[PDB]
Design an enzyme around this catalytic site. Structure first.
Site, PDB file in Angstrom:
ATOM      1  N   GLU A   1      61.536  68.183  70.919  1.00 25.67           N
ATOM      2  CA  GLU A   1      62.160  67.814  69.905  1.00 25.67           C
ATOM      3  C   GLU A   1      64.078  67.612  70.434  1.00 25.67           C
ATOM      4  O   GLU A   1      64.847  67.112  69.928  1.00 25.67           O
ATOM      5  CB  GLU A   1      62.149  68.907  68.574  1.00 25.67           C
ATOM      6  CG  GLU A   1      62.164  68.798  67.274  1.00 25.67           C
ATOM      7  CD  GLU A   1      61.842  69.368  66.401  1.00 25.67           C
ATOM      8  OE1 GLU A   1      61.364  70.343  66.941  1.00 25.67           O
ATOM      9  OE2 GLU A   1      62.935  69.685  65.357  1.00 25.67           O
TER      10      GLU A   1
ATOM     11  N   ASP B   1      70.949  69.717  60.645  1.00 29.57           N
ATOM     12  CA  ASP B   1      70.747  70.483  60.359  1.00 29.57           C
ATOM     13  C   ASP B   1      71.915  72.078  59.951  1.00 29.57           C
ATOM     14  O   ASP B   1      72.547  72.392  58.451  1.00 29.57           O
ATOM     15  CB  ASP B   1      68.777  71.968  60.076  1.00 29.57           C
ATOM     16  CG  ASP B   1      68.431  70.097  59.877  1.00 29.57           C
ATOM     17  OD1 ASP B   1      68.278  69.534  59.233  1.00 29.57           O
ATOM     18  OD2 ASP B   1      66.904  70.578  59.661  1.00 29.57           O
TER      19      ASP B   1
HETATM   20  C1  LIG Z   1      61.052  74.716  55.850  1.00 30.86           C
HETATM   21  O1  LIG Z   1      59.839  74.938  56.000  1.00 30.86           O
HETATM   22  C2  LIG Z   1      58.941  74.234  55.383  1.00 30.86           C
HETATM   23  C3  LIG Z   1      58.481  72.770  55.561  1.00 30.86           C
HETATM   24  C4  LIG Z   1      58.387  72.702  57.483  1.00 30.86           C
HETATM   25  C5  LIG Z   1      58.537  71.302  57.634  1.00 30.86           C
HETATM   26  C6  LIG Z   1      60.245  71.031  57.634  1.00 30.86           C
HETATM   27  C7  LIG Z   1      60.495  69.457  58.819  1.00 30.86           C
HETATM   28  C8  LIG Z   1      60.958  69.362  59.775  1.00 30.86           C
HETATM   29  C9  LIG Z   1      61.955  68.315  60.678  1.00 30.86           C
HETATM   30  C10 LIG Z   1      62.291  67.905  61.501  1.00 30.86           C
HETATM   31  N1  LIG Z   1      64.009  67.374  61.998  1.00 30.86           N
HETATM   32  C11 LIG Z   1      64.543  68.388  61.405  1.00 30.86           C
HETATM   33  C12 LIG Z   1      66.164  67.493  61.751  1.00 30.86           C
HETATM   34  O2  LIG Z   1      67.096  68.356  62.231  1.00 30.86           O
HETATM   35  C13 LIG Z   1      66.575  66.129  61.259  1.00 30.86           C
HETATM   36  O3  LIG Z   1      66.829  65.053  61.513  1.00 30.86           O
HETATM   37  C14 LIG Z   1      64.811  65.553  61.292  1.00 30.86           C
HETATM   38  O4  LIG Z   1      64.900  64.764  60.493  1.00 30.86           O
HETATM   39  C15 LIG Z   1      63.453  66.248  60.754  1.00 30.86           C
HETATM   40  C16 LIG Z   1      62.308  65.656  60.698  1.00 30.86           C
HETATM   41  O5  LIG Z   1      62.357  64.780  62.009  1.00 30.86           O
END
Ligand SMILES: COCCCCCCCCCN1C[C@H](O)[C@@H](O)[C@H](O)[C@H]1CO
Length: 765
Positions: free
Chosen positions: A735, A538
């Site tokens: 995480e 990110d």
């Molecule tokens: C803005 O807020 C409203 C939406 C909230 C929900 C967002 C989804 C969570 C994403 C978690 N996660 C972030 C990692 O940097 C990514 O590499 C990864 O693929 C992803 C999924 O595990």
């Protein structure tokens, strides 16, 4: 025989507890069909049950923990739930019983045990909620013999095209049922199991909580209307016990109240299978699944030193069972902006403002319906398919059940549109949308994500080159079956490859740029001033400001991954014309990685941009991105560049923490800034890639064999121990992990690629 293994796979996988967004529920792999879900909550007052009731997954102070102790989607498993708010330890056992022509039968036992802290006389309300979507289908609760409700079992008889005839039984259960001596008992009964049978338009049946509460609310209004008041009020648990009204409908609410500990069974009997499922069957089949789970784990995940101990075995089983237990089936429309607005080409400076302007047109619309069968990162927080996560998820899953993994890959690839795009985040249907702010639902056809599903395909290729038991490995054991799978998948892989090169192309020609190939250069679309969400990392620091002349070395490395896969797969299918093209692409990426991305001054790879003076500049931020050609298997084992990368990896003052590799160097100006998401924490997925690559160099003749061996040994240990220590102390996968303190941080229940630890412990890559 490929059509045959397919049908056998379909029948075996049809039923499951495939609703990981909720604590416990079942649905088959059919968009519009029969679904169940469990609710429970203590009731101590006239207003508390609305706040105690549990249905959808969450994680907060009121919940100690939950997850699957054992799980295999062909057989079933056992989940345990440690609920503080409700003073309950709950066990939900699920087992499938094959037979008939409609994907077989299944049973579940729900068991609640009050914890030591709960009042011995706690009243707990338990609901089993059953819904059925479909135009020409039927479901009916057989009425009680008794006048106010059920003394014994609740039988639902139903039918649909998909399921044929079936019966679903909710057994009487064991536990004290409280009795009210109130006047109301004359009209409502003293206290008993009740069933309400209702109908709503199909599309809202998933809203189990509101629908339940609307019925509870109607019962309370009847009380008020009928002169039951605060002068002499029935007990709370009786006020919240629905009036019995079994019947036909597409919704059936089965409600029980217990005092103290309780259990009850759910018995789904597929009529086409013959003899109906009993509670005795459930118990036998539950014991047998455990035995089989045990035998397979020991074989598939044979934990090596120094993790051979029983403590690590329990840890590995929890991490694995939660990963594979997260598998869900999702169905419904997706929200997609299909404008292909020209602002999305990002060809100008300041493109992010233009792209914002286009998004503000809000041309997005629902499309589909689609389905997806996938594992997920997070039950409580984001229980849905993420494209690059799934590549990591399937690495341990494929070991366990390659046919299962290939089924999931296939499911993902069936979402690819005509151009070669799969949305990186799959929010399918109103139920999935309920968990997602509207501003974050829209998918964009120019947004990619890393093609990590190729890594899974790579593993299957290697295995191919070199009844539920048989089923799990049919695709490797019958080489004919495997190849047909690849043959049918291959054009989609080829299409996605072409899509990356068309939509995610970087710009060599417009600038003073010199390189072995004029073609090979990449830039993730969708970047904003502070983020690059499509890359998966990110907020890892990128060239400032973002610029149409940027080149991203991780993206090029991923294309390197895909082309290597396409070489192996094309070669298996004898696509000579294809393999020759791929071969020149790989050669070119090998050269351009050096020409466009290598910094001799820094001793690592860097993203590139274009200067204020229109010149190529490297922008170096030492961390995961820097290592990418190494991480993705692209460098030769005697490369001097690989050797400098090993130095960076092992350098404590840069990346090497006692807890794993830091996402960003402690020396980088951006270390621990802003949200600090990928700017210092240890992430298991990237650490896994490092570990696997170190092992490769460690098990091969070359100048770095022994450096790699030492780093492999230590990193494996550091990563496994960090995840284990946190699991022991908190009960969670996290995480990411703090490189200073070793603490798990950000979200819990991340299983999720943190679960790769099972395979790290297993080793022998
Ligand atoms: C803005 O807020 C409203 C939406 C909230 C929900 C967002 C989804 C969570 C994403 C978690 N996660 C972030 C990692 O940097 C990514 O590499 C990864 O693929 C992803 C999924 O595990």
């Amino acid at each position: 025989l490929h059509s045959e293994i397919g049908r056998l796979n379909n029948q075996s996988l049809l039923w499951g507890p495939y609703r990981p967004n909720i604590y416990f529920g079942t649905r088959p792999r059919i968009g519009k069909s029969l679904m169940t879900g469990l609710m429970w909550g203590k009731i101590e007052s006239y207003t508390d049950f609305q706040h105690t009731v549990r249905y959808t997954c969450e994680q907060n102070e009121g919940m100690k923990g939950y997850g699957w102790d054992e799980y295999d989607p062909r057989r079933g498993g056992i989940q345990s739930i440690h609920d503080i708010q409700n003073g309950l330890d709950i066990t939900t056992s699920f087992v499938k019983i094959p037979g008939g022509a409609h994907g077989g039968s299944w049973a579940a036992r729900i068991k609640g045990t009050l914890n030591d802290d709960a009042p011995k006389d706690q009243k707990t309300i338990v609901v089993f909620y059953v819904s059925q979507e479909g135009e020409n289908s039927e479901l009916e609760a057989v009425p009680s013999e008794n006048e106010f409700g059920y003394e014994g079992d609740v039988i639902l008889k139903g039918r649909s095209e998909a399921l044929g005839n079936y019966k679903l039984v909710v057994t009487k259960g064991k536990g004290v049922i409280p009795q009210s001596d109130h006047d109301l008992s004359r009209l409502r009964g003293p206290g008993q199991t009740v069933v309400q049978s209702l109908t709503y338009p199909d599309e809202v049946l998933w809203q189990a909580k509101p629908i339940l509460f609307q019925q509870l609310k109607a019962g309370i209004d009847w009380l008020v209307e009928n002169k039951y008041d605060v002068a002499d009020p029935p007990p709370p648990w009786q006020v919240y016990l629905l009036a019995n009204k079994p019947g036909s409908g597409n919704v059936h609410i089965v409600q029980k109240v217990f005092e103290g500990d309780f259990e009850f069974d759910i018995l789904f009997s597929s009529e086409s299978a013959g003899k109906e499922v009993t509670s005795k069957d459930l118990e036998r089949e539950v014991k047998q699944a455990t035995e089989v789970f045990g035998e397979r784990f020991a074989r598939v995940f044979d934990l090596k030193a120094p993790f051979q101990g029983d403590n690590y075995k329990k840890f590995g089983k929890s991490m694995f069972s939660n990963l594979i237990g997260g598998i869900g089936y999702f169905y419904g429309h997706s929200l997609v902006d299909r404008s292909y607005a020209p602002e999305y080409d990002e060809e100008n400076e300041g493109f992010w403002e233009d792209a914002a302007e286009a998004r503000a047109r809000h041309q997005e619309a629902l499309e589909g319906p689609y389905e997806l069968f996938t594992s997920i990162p997070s039950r409580p927080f984001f229980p849905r398919g993420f494209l690059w996560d799934e590549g990591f998820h399937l690495l341990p899953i494929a070991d366990w059940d390659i046919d299962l993994a290939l089924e999931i890959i296939k499911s993902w690839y069936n979402l690819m549109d005509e151009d070669g795009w799969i949305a990186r985040e799959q929010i399918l249907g109103a139920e999935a949308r309920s968990k997602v702010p509207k501003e974050f639902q829209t998918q964009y056809p120019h947004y990619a994500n890393p093609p990590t599903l190729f890594l899974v395909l790579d593993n299957f290729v290697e295995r191919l080159r070199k009844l539920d038991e048989t089923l799990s490995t049919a695709s490797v054991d019958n080489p004919e079956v495997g190849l047909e799978y690849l043959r049918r998948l291959y054009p989609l892989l080829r299409r996605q490859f072409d899509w990356f090169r068309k939509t995610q192309a970087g710009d060599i020609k417009s600038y003073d740029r010199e390189a072995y190939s004029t073609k090979e250069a990449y830039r993730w679309r969708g970047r904003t001033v502070s983020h690059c969400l499509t890359s998966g990392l990110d907020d890892y620091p990128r060239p400032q400001p973002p610029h149409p002349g940027e080149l991203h070395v991780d993206l090029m490395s991923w294309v390197g991954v895909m082309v290597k896969s396409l070489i192996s797969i094309g070669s298996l299918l004898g696509a000579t014309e294809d393999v020759e093209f791929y071969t020149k692409v790989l050669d070119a990426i090998e050269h351009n990685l050096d020409d466009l991305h290598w910094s001799e001054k820094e001793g690592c790879y860097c993203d590139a941009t274009i200067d204020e003076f229109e010149e190529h500049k490297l922008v170096c931020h030492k961390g995961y991105i820097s290592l990418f050609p190494f991480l993705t298997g692209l460098l030769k084992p005697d490369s001097p560049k690989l050797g400098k990368l090993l130095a960076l990896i092992g350098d404590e003052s840069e990346l090497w923490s006692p807890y794993g590799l830091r996402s960003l160097s402690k020396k980088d100006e951006f270390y621990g800034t802003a949200e600090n998401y990928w700017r210092s924490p240890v992430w298991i997925n990237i650490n896994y890639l490092a570990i696997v690559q170190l092992y490769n160099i460690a098990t091969q003749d070359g100048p770095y064999k022994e450096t790699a061996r030492d780093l492999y040994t230590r990193l494996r240990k550091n990563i496994v121990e960090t995840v284990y220590r946190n699991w022991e102390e908190t009960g969670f996968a996290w995480e990411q992990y703090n490189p200073e303190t070793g603490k798990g941080q950000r979200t819990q229940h991340f299983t999720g690629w943190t679960s790769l630890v099972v395979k790290i412990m297993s080793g022998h890559h």
